[PDB]
């Protein structure tokens, strides 16, 4: 797993809540 | 009391205009409900897409008070939504082909019937006065408020009535403003 430095805000997409 | 967008039944990130008939979306999908809801009869309102930049989207329709304000419309069993992108209809976050999509400059109509006794409720959507067909039948029972769900800085305006730019020709109804 890649390791972070600061916090990174997630950028949602339009289908982020949809069952595929 | 004027039927407007709600003062507090709203996701705080959404930008609401002073007269509470306009909303700009912020980032991920978030929802605002109107100030009044209906439980019996046929009711109507119109939404105008003021501006729809690329990669922004809307899911518009009818919601119950328990619907999630921090999720898109139609995420729950409490809301039913119509997505600009591809015209998909949504309920419990299941997307189904319903109609063609809509975009900037279109005026959309929202018809709901909650007949008195049991009578079969339905939801019908309109694009610029044109019936797109029945979207849903026999929906979850309860009180439904006009709901707006926007993804990423698009702007939409709402008309609760009493007079609409494209009043439906084939159905009887009362405007939401009568509430």
């Amino acid at each position: 797993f890649k390791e972070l430095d600061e916090n990174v805000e997630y950028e949602e997409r339009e289908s982020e809540f949809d069952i595929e | 009391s004027r039927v407007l967008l709600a003062l507090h039944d709203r996701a705080p990130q959404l930008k609401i205009s002073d007269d509470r008939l306009t909303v700009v979306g912020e980032k991920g999908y978030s929802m605002v409900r109107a100030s009044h809801g209906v439980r019996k009869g046929a009711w109507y309102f119109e939404i105008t897409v003021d501006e729809m930049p690329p990669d922004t989207a809307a899911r518009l329709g009818w919601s119950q008070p328990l619907g999630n304000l921090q999720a898109p419309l139609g995420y729950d069993k409490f809301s039913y939504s119509w997505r600009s992108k591809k015209g998909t209809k949504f309920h419990q976050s299941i997307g189904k082909h319903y109609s063609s999509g809509y975009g900037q400059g279109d005026v959309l109509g929202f018809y709901i019937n909650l007949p008195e006794d049991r009578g079969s409720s339905e939801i019908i959507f309109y694009k610029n006065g044109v019936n797109q067909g029945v979207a849903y039948k026999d929906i979850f029972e309860g009180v439904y408020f006009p709901a707006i769900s926007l993804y990423k800085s698009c702007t939409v305006s709402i008309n609760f009535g009493p007079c609409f730019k494209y009043p439906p020709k084939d159905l009887t109804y009362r405007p939401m403003s009568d509430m």
Binding site: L4, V8, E9 | -
Partner: protein, 163 residues
Amino acid sequence: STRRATSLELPMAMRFRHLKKTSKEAVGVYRSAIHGRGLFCKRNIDAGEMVIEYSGIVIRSVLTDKREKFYDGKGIGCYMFRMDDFDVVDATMHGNAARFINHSCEPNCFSRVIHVEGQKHIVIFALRRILRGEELTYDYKFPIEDAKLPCNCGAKRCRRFLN
């Protein structure tokens, strides 16, 4: 003349933007007698001192259930920290050494949400003087569940379960 009050929020901001240099001198990952790998203390650490931030991908709080069913469905792991009633730090795929901190019922550190500039960060502070070599540790404060994650913090008065 005007009476002035002391700002606790100014030195906290000054302390935070030095944390990333501070933690790399202070902490390290080793094998734990509690569980797997754990974060340990590489130099004497004083009370109230900031140890490290629980950095990750900050997603909205509504996306937790979908995230957990994708994580726990694919068998990946929890690695999620609640920041707010609106925001949650997902360190599952992107994080730092703070995700190796184990839980105890008798911790020597505690978690706190603080504000710097306009954002919030989850930072771990030392509850007491912590000597070089100790394993750093805080109370996860998991929600209580039913038939259960066994805890191995190995200190007496241990609640016998992580939740």
